[PDB]
């Protein structure tokens, strides 16, 4: 019934991820350090990345309004859910704090 919303949301998310597909975002390593990761390392179909990004709380709403997305948070959520390398490299506790901080910063 509301296909127009799902189409506009998917294209807004697809647009922002394609634009920043190679950008190196910073994530907490288990050694208190920092490690870098981008969407290109997810080794996932481009459609699937956008599908997963739609599950991140607050993203689909931000995409409906055409606002800038917290892509570091989206990348971290998608990788944590899909990438075993990312999981084994990240400190999940501080990641959730950062994702919650950047998801409360945005809205």
Swiss-Prot record:
A motif (Nuclear localization signal) lies at residues 23-26. It comes from the Viruses. Phosphorylated by host PKC and by an unknown kinase. The modification Phosphoserine is found at residues 22, 83. Non catalytic polymerase cofactor and regulatory protein that plays a role in viral transcription and replication. Stabilizes the RNA polymerase L to the N-RNA template and binds the soluble protein N, preventing it from encapsidating non-genomic RNA. Also inhibits host IFN-alpha and IFN-beta signaling by binding and retaining phosphorylated STAT1 in the cytoplasm or by inhibiting the DNA binding of STAT1 in the nucleus. Might be involved, through interaction with host dynein, in intracellular microtubule-dependent virus transport of incoming virus from the synapse toward the cell body. Belongs to the lyssavirus protein P family. This is Phosphoprotein. It comes from Rabies virus (strain Nishigahara RCEH) (RABV).
């Amino acid at each position: 019934t509301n296909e127009e919303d799902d189409l506009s949301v998917e294209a807004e998310i697809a647009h922002q991820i394609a634009e920043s597909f190679e950008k190196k975002y910073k994530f907490p390593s288990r050694s208190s350090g920092i490690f870098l990761y981008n969407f290109e390392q997810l080794k996932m179909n481009l459609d699937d990345i956008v599908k997963e990004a739609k599950n991140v709380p607050g993203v689909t709403r931000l995409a409906h309004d055409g606002s800038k997305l917290p892509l570091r948070c989206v990348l971290g959520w998608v990788a944590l859910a899909n990438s075993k390398k990312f999981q084994l490299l990240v400190e999940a506790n501080k990641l959730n704090k950062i994702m919650q901080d950047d998801l409360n910063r945005y809205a």
